[PDB]
């Protein structure tokens, strides 16, 4: 599923990302845009045998288990397949665990490069929230 921008913002707000550990909703919508263009089914294969899954492109080496990635840690204790649903529940739960590390949202390279301290609010204003 490819979320509309505002549709995703409302969904992320419902899933409690707005102000989660000090991160306003704008940051998450922006991150999603640059990571997968709001596409829940996005997948990216890496050189180390790992794959990124979902709206927020979470790594299978560190965060989820896809049963075929060497050195898997599965920090989010979840099947990577769950990160490819039209239901963002799993992706949000895992994103929250990731952002709870000292690295914060710096975990997402695309976020640091195109979202990190900019007017991320620009991604949410205009919407019905």
């Amino acid at each position, epitope marked *: 599923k490819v979320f509309g921008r505002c549709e995703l913002a409302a969904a992320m707000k419902r899933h409690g990302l*707005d102000n989660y550990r000090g991160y306003s909703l704008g940051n998450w919508v922006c991150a999603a845009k640059f990571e997968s263009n709001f596409n829940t089914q996005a997948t990216n294969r890496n050189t180390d045998g790992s794959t990124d899954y979902g709206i927020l492109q979470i790594n299978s080496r560190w965060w989820c288990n896809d049963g075929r990635t060497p050195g898997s840690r599965n920090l989010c204790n979840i099947p990577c397949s769950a990160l490819l649903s039209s239901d963002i529940t799993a992706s949000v739960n895992c994103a929250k665990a990731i952002v*709870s590390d000292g690295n914060g949202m710096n975990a997402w390279v695309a976020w640091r490069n195109r979202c990190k301290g900019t007017d991320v609010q620009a991604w949410i204003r205009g919407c019905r929230l």
Partner: antibody
Amino acid sequence: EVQLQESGPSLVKPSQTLSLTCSVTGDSVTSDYWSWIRKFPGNKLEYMGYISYSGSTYYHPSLKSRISITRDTSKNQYYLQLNSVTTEDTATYYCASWGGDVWGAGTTVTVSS
Amino acid sequence: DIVLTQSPATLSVTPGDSVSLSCRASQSISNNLHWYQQKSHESPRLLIKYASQSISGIPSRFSGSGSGTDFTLSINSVETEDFGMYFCQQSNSWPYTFGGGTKLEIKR
């Protein structure tokens, strides 16, 4: 198959250091974030802090700085250190996964001279 | 910092009754509220995560609802093994904090 178990002295004298060990079995000490929670005699609960994958730690402001959380990847255990304790640090200490899905049985630590 | 207020402090019911436990936050925490059960001093057990998410392996009679500052833990048809303490915990902001807890007791 993850299981946790707290261990350490049950008695600490005022002003001294409280030390506890949490043994992780079933999975590595680096396959999740790890926390320490305490339950006072009155039943109130306090989330002392946790250590995440990067080694970064988060400590409850109330503990000032008396607290340290560390881990040993070789033994697959993580520890809790609480300095300059007082009678008020008497409580039941639990180690648990940051996900809250796994908790140790808990161990009582009494502070008295 | 965030203060979680639970009520009632104690509830006395007969097995078969349904109950609803309240937890209110001093600041909005969206859906970052979790519910725990503990029969004594014995280890807490996560029942509901993120306000309403079910956890595989937890009896279906347990359910949670709410968002922002008002949350509710519902137990439909309390079973004899359900008596004990219930606590809510927020993970929206550090430090994580727990509510004062509600004691579920047997009525006679």
